[PDB]
PDB file of C-alpha atoms in Angstrom:
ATOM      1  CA  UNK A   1     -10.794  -9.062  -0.519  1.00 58.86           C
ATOM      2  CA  UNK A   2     -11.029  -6.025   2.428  1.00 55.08           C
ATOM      3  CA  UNK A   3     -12.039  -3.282   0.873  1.00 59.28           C
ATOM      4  CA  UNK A   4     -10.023  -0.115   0.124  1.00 56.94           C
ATOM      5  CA  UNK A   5      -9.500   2.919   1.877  1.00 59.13           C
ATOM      6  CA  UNK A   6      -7.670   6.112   0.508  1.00 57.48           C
ATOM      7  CA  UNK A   7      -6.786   9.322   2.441  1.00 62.89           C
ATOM      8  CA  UNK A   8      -4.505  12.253   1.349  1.00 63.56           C
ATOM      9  CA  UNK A   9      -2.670  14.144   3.961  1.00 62.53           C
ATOM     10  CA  UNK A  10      -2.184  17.939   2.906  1.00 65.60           C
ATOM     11  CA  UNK A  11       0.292  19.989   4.768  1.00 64.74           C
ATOM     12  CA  UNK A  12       0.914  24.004   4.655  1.00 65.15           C
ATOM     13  CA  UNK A  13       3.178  25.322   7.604  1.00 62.14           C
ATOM     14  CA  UNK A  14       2.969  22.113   8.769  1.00 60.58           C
ATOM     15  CA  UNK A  15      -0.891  22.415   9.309  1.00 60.20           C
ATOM     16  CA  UNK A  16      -2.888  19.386   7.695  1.00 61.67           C
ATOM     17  CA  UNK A  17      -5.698  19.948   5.328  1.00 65.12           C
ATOM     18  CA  UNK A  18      -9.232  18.550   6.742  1.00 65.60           C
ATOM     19  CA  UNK A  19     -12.770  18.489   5.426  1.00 64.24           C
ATOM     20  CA  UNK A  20     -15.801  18.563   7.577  1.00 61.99           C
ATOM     21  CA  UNK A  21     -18.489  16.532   6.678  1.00 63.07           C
ATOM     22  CA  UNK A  22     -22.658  17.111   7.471  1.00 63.43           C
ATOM     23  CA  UNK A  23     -22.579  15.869  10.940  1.00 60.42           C
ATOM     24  CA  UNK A  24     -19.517  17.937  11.674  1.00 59.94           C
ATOM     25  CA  UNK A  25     -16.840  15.766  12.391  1.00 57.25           C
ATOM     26  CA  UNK A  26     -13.263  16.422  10.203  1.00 59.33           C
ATOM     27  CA  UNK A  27     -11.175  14.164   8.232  1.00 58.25           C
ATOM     28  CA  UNK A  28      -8.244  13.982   5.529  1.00 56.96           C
ATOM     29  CA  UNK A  29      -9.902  14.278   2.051  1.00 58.61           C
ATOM     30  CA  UNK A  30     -10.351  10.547   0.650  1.00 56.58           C
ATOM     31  CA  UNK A  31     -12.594   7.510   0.352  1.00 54.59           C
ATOM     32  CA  UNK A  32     -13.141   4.098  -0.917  1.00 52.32           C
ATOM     33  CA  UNK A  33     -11.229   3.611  -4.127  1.00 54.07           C
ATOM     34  CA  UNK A  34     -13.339   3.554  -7.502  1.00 53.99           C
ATOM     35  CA  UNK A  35     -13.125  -0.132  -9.111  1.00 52.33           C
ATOM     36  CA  UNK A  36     -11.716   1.554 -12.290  1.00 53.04           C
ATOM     37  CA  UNK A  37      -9.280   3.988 -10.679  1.00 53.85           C
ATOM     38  CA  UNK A  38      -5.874   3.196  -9.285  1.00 56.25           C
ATOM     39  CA  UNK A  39      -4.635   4.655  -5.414  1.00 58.36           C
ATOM     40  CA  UNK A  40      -3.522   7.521  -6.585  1.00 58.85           C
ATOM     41  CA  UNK A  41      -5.977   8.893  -9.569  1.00 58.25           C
ATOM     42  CA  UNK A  42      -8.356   7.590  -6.727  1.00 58.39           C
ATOM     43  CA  UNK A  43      -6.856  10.269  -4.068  1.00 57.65           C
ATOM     44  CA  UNK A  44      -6.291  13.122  -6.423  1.00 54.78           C
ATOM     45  CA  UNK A  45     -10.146  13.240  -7.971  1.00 53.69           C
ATOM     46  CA  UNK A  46     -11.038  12.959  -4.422  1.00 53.38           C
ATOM     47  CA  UNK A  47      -8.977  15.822  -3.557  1.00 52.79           C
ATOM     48  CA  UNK A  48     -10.489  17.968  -6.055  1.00 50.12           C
ATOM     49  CA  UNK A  49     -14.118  16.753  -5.492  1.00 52.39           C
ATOM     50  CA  UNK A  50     -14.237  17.399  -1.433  1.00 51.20           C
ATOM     51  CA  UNK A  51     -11.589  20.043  -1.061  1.00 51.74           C
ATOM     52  CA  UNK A  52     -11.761  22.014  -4.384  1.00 50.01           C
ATOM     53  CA  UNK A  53      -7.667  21.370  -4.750  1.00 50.09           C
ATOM     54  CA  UNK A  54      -5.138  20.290  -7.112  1.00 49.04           C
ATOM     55  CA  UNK A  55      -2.903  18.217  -5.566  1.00 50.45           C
ATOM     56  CA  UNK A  56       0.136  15.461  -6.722  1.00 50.82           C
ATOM     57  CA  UNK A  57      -0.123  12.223  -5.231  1.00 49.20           C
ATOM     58  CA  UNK A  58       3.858  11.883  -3.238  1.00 49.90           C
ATOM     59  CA  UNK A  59       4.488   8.853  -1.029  1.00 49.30           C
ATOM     60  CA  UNK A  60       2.431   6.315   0.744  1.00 49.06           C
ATOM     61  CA  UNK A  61       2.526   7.057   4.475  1.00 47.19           C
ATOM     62  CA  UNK A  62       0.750   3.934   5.443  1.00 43.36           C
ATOM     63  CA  UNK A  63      -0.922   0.712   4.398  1.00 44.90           C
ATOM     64  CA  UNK A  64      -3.138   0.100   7.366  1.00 43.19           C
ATOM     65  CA  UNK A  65      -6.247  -2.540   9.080  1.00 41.28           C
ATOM     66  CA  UNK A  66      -8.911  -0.491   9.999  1.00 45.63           C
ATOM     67  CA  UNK A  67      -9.778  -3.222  12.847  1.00 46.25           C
ATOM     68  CA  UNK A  68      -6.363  -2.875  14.102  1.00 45.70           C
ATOM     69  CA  UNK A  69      -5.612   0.927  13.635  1.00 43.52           C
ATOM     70  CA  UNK A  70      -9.314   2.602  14.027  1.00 44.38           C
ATOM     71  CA  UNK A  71     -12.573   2.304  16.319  1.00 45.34           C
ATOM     72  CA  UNK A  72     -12.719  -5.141   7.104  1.00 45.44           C
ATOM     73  CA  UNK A  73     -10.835  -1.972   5.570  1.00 45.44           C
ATOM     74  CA  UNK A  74      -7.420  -1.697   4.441  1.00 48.50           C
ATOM     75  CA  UNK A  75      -6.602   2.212   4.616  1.00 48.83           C
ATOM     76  CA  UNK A  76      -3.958   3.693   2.253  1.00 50.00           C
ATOM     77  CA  UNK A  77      -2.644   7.275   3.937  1.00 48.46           C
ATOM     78  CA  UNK A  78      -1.184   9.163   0.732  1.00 48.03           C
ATOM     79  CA  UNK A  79       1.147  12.217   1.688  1.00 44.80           C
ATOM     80  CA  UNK A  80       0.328  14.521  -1.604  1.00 45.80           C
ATOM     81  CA  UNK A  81       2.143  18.055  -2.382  1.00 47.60           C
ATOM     82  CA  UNK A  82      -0.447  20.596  -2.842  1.00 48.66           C
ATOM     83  CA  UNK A  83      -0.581  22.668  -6.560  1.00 49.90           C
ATOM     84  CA  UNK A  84      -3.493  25.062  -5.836  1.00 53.13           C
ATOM     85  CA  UNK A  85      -7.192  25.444  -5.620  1.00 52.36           C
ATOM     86  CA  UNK A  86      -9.967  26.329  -2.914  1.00 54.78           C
ATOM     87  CA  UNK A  87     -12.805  24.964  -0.846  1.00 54.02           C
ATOM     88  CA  UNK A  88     -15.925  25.455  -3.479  1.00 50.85           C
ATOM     89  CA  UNK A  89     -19.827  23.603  -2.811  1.00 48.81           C
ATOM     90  CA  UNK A  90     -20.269  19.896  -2.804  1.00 48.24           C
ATOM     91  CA  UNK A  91     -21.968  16.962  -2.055  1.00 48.41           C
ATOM     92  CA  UNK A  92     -19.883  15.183  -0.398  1.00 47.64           C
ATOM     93  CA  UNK A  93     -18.340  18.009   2.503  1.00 46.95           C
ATOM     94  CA  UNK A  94     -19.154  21.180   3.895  1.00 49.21           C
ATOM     95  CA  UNK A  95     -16.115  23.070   5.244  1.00 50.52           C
ATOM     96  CA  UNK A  96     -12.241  22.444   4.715  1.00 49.81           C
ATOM     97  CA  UNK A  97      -8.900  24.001   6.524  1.00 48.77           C
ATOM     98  CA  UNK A  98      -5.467  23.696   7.421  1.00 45.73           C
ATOM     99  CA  UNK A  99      -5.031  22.526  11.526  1.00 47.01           C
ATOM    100  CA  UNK A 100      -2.008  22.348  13.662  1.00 50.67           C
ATOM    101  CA  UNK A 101      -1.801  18.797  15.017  1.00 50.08           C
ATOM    102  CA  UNK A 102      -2.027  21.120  19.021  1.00 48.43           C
ATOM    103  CA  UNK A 103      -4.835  22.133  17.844  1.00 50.75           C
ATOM    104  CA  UNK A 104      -7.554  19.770  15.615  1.00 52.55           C
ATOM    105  CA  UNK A 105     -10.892  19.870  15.263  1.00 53.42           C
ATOM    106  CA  UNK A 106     -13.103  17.272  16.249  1.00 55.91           C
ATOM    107  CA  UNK A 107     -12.483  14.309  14.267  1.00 55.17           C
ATOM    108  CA  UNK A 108     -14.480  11.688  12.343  1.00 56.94           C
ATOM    109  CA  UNK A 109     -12.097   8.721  14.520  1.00 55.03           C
ATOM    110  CA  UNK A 110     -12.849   5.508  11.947  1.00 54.13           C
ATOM    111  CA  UNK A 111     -11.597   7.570   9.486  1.00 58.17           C
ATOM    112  CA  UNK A 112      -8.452   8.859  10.772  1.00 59.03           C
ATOM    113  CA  UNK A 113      -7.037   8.941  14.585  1.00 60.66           C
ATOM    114  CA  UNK A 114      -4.861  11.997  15.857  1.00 63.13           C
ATOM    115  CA  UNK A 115      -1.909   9.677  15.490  1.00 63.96           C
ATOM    116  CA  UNK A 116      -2.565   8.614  12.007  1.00 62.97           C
ATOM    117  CA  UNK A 117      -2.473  12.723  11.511  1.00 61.07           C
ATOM    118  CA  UNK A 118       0.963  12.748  13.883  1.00 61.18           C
ATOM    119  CA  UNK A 119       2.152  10.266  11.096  1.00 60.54           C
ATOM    120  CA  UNK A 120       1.480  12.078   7.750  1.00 64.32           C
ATOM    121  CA  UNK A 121       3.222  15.040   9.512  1.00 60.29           C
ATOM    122  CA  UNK A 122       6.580  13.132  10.386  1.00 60.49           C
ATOM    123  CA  UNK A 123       6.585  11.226   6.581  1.00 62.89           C
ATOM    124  CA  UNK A 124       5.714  14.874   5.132  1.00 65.25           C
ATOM    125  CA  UNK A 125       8.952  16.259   7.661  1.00 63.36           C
ATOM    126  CA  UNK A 126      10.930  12.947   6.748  1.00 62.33           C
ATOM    127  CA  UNK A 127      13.572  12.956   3.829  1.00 65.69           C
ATOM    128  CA  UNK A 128      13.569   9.476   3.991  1.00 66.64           C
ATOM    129  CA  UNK A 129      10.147   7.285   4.704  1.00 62.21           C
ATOM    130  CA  UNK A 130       9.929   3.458   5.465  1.00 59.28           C
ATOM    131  CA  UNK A 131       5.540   2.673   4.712  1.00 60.21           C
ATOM    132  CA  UNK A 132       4.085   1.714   7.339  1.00 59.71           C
ATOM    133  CA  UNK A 133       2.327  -1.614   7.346  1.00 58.16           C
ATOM    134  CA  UNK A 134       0.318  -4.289   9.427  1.00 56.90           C
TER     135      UNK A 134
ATOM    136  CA  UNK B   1     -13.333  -1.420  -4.532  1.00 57.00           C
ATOM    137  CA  UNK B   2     -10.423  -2.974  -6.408  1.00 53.79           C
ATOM    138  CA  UNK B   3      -9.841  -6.244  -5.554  1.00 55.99           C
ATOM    139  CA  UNK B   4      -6.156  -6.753  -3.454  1.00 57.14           C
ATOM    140  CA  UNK B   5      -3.605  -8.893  -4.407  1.00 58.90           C
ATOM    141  CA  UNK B   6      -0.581  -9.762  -2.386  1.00 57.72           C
ATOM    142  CA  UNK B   7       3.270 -11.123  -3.559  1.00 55.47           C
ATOM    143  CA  UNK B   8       5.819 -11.853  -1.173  1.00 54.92           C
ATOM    144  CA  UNK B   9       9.663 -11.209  -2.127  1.00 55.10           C
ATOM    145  CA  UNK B  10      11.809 -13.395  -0.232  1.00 54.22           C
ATOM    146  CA  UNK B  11      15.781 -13.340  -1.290  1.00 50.64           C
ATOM    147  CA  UNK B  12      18.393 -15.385  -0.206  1.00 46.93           C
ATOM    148  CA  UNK B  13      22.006 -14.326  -2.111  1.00 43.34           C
ATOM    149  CA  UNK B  14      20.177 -11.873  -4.026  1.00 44.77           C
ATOM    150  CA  UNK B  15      18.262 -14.894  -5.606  1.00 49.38           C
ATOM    151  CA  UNK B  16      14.399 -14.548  -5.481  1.00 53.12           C
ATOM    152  CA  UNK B  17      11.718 -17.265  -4.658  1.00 55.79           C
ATOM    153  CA  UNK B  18       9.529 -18.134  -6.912  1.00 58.75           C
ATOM    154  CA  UNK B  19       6.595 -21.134  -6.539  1.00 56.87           C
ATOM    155  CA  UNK B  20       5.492 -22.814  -9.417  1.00 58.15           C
ATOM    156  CA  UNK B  21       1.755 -24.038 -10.288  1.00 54.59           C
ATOM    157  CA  UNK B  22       0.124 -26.365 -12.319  1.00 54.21           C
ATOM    158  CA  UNK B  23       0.598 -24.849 -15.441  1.00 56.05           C
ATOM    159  CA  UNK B  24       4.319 -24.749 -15.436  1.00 56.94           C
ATOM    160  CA  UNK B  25       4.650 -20.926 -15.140  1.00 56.77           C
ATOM    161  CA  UNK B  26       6.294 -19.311 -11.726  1.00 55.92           C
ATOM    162  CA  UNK B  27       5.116 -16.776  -9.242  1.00 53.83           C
ATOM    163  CA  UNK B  28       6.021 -15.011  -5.965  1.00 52.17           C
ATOM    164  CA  UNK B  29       3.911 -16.386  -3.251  1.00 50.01           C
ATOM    165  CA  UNK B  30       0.933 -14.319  -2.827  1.00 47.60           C
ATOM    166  CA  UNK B  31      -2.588 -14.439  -3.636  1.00 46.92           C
ATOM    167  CA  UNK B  32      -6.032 -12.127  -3.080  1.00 49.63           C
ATOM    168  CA  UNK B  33      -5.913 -10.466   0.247  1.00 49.76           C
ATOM    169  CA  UNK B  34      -8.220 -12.629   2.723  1.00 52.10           C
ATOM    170  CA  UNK B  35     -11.131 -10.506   3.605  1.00 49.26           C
ATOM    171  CA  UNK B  36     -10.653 -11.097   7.843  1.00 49.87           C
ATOM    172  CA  UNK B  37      -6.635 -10.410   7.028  1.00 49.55           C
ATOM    173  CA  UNK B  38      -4.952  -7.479   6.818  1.00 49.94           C
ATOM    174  CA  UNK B  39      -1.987  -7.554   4.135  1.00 48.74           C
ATOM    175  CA  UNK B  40       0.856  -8.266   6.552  1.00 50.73           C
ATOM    176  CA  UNK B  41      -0.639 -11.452   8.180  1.00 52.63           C
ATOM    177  CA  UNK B  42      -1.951 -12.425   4.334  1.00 57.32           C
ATOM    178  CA  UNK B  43       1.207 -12.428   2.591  1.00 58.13           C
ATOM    179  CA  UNK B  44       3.240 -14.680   5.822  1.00 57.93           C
ATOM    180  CA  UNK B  45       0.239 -17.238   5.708  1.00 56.36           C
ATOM    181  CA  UNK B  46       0.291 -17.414   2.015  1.00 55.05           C
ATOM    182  CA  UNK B  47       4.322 -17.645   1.789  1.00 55.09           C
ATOM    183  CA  UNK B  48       4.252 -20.501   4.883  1.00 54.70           C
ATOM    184  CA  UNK B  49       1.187 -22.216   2.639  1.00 57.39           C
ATOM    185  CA  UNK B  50       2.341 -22.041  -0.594  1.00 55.76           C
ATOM    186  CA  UNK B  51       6.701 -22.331   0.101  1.00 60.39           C
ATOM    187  CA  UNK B  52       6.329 -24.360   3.656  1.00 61.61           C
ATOM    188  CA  UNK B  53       8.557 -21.305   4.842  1.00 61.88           C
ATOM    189  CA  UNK B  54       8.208 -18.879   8.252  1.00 61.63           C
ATOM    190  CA  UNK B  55       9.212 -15.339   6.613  1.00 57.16           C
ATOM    191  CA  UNK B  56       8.745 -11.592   8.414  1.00 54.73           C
ATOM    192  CA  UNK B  57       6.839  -9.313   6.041  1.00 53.91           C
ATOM    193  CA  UNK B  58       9.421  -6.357   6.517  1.00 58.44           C
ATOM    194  CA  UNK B  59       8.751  -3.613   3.725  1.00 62.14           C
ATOM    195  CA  UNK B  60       6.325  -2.077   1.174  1.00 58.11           C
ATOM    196  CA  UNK B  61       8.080  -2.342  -2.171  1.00 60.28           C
ATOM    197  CA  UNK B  62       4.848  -1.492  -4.151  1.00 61.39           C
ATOM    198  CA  UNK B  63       1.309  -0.793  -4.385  1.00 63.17           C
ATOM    199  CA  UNK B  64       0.237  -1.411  -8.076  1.00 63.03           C
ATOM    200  CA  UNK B  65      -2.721  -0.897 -10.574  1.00 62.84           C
ATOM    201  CA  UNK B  66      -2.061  -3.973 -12.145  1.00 61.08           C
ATOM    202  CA  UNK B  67      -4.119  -2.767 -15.438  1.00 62.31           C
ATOM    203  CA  UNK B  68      -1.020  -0.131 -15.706  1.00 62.93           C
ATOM    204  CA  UNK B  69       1.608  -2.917 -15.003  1.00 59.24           C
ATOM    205  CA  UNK B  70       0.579  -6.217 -15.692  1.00 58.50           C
ATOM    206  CA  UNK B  71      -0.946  -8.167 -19.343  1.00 51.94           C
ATOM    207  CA  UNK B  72      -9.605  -4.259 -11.354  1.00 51.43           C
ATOM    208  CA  UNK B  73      -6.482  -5.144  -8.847  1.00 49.58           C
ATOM    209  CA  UNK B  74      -4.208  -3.455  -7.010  1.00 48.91           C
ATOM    210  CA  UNK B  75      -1.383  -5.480  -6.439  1.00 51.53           C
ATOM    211  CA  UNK B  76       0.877  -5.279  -2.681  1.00 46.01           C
ATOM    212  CA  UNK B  77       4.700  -6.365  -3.180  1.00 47.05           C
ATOM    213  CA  UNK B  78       5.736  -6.685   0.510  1.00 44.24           C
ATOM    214  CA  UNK B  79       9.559  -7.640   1.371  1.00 42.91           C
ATOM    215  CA  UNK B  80       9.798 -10.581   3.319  1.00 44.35           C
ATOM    216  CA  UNK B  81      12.784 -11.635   5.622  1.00 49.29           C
ATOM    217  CA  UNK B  82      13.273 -15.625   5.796  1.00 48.20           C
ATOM    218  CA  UNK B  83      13.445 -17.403   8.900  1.00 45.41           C
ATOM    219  CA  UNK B  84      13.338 -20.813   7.631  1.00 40.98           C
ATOM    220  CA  UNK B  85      11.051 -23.431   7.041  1.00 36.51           C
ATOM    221  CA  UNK B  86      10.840 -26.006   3.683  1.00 35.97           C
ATOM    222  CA  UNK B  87       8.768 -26.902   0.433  1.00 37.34           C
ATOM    223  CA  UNK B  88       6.097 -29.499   1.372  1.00 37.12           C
ATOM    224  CA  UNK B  89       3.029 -30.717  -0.919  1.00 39.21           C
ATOM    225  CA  UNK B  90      -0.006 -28.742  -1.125  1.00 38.50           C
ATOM    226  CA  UNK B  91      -2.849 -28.200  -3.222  1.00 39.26           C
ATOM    227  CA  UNK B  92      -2.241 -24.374  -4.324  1.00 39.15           C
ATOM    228  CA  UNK B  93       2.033 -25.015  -5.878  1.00 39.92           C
ATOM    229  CA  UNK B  94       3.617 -27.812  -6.795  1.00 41.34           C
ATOM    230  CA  UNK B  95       7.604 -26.219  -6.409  1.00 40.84           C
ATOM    231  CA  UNK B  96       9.904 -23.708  -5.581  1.00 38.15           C
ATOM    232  CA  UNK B  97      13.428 -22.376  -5.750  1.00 42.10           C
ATOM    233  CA  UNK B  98      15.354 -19.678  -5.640  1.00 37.85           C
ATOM    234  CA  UNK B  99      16.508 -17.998  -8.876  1.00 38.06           C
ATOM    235  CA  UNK B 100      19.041 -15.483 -10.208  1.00 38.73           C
ATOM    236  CA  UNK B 101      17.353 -12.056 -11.644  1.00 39.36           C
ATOM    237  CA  UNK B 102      20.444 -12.871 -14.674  1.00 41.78           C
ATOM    238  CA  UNK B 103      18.710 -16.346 -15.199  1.00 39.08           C
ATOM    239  CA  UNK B 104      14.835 -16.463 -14.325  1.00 39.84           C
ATOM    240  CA  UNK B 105      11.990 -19.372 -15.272  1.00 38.60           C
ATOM    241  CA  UNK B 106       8.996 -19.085 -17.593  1.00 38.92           C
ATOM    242  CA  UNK B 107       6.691 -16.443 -15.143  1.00 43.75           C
ATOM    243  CA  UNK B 108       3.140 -16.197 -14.382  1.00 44.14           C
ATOM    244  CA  UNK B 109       3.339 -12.309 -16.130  1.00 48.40           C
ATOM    245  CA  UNK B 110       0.159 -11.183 -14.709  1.00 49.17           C
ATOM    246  CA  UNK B 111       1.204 -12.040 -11.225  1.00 45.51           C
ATOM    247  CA  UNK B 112       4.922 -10.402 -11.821  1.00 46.66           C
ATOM    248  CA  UNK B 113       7.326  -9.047 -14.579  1.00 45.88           C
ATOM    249  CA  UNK B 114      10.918  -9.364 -14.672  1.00 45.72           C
ATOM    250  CA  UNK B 115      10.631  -5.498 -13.974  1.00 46.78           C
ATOM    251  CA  UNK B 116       8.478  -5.961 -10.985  1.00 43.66           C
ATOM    252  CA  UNK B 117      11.193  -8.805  -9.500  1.00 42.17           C
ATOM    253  CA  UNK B 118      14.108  -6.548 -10.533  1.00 40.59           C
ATOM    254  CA  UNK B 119      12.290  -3.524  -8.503  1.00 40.20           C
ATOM    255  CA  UNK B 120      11.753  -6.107  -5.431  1.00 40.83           C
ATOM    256  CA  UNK B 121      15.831  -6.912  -5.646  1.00 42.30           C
ATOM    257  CA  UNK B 122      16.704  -2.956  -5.566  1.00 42.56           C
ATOM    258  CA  UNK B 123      14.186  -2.893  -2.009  1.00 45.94           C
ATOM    259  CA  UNK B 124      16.154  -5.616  -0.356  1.00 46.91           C
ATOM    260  CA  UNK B 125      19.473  -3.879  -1.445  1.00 48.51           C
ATOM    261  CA  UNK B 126      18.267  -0.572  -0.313  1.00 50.94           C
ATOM    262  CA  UNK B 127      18.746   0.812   3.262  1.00 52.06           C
ATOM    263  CA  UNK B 128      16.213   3.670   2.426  1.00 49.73           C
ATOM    264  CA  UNK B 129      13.675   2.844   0.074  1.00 48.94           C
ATOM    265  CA  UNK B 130      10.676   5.011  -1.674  1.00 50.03           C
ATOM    266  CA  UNK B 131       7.467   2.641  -1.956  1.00 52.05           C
ATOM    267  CA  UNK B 132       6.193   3.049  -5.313  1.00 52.87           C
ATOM    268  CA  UNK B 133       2.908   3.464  -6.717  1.00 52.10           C
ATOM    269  CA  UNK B 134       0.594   4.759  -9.424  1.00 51.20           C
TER     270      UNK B 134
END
């Protein structure tokens, strides 16, 4: 089957949380989801692990093809509610901050597009959401 | 990752279709995601395939662990709209019907619960409608 793709979108004042990664590019925390783990306990440890923060897993943005949405992956977008936390030393990222969608950083594209980010913003200003699918 | 697994809810009168396989027991059309498919274009091939019908995969009802919901697979109920078409042999079902939530057939439990069908009938009923997940 294609494999699985999560990403959590993080917002603050409107501002989305990203993480940079070694060659400098930024993206929503996430990953390929661990064979034992479900979407969200997938989403939530991979909160914590790249962005140091606690975070509750809220509504599913998106269910989306990779081929068809970025430059075989199926790509969950996860809107999550943020508890607490902060940035601390890992592995996996270097960096992490909140970004106005006028103003992002440069972007790691196959991972998430500016109008993936436009999306998570509208479902996290939405009372209502319809998940988006293709 | 965890493999994907796709069910199609089609209603007609608030009745649900079901397909029935070899062993007697009844299912939603559906299947493992095809790896060159995304989950949209699965679920319509496997509904026209497995019912002989044309449907329009319309809304996310759920995206579940099925090791937390059913007797590694995350499982996609999609809402499906039907635009016609008829049951005609193959070699994957062998019938199919639509049945009453109030009066349902032996079911293929690891590929849906009553719950799981009874969640499906509250999407089509519902003008908004919260995907769920876990």
């Amino acid at each position: 089957t294609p494999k699985l793709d999560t990403r959590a979108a993080i917002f603050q004042e409107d501002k989305i949380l990203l993480v940079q990664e070694n060659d400098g590019l930024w993206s929503l925390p996430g990953g390929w989801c661990d064979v034992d783990q479900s979407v969200k306990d997938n989403v939530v440890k991979e909160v914590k692990e790249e962005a140091g923060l606690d975070v509750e897993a809220q509504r599913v943005v998106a269910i989306l093809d990779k081929h068809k949405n970025n430059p075989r992956v199926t790509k969950v977008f996860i809107l999550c509610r943020l508890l607490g936390g902060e940035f601390q030393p890992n592995s996996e990222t270097v960096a992490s901050g909140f970004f106005s969608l006028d103003d992002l950083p440069p972007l790691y594209l196959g991972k998430n597009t500016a109008e993936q980010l436009a999306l998570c913003l509208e479902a996290s200003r939405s009372e209502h959401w319809e998940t988006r699918f293709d």
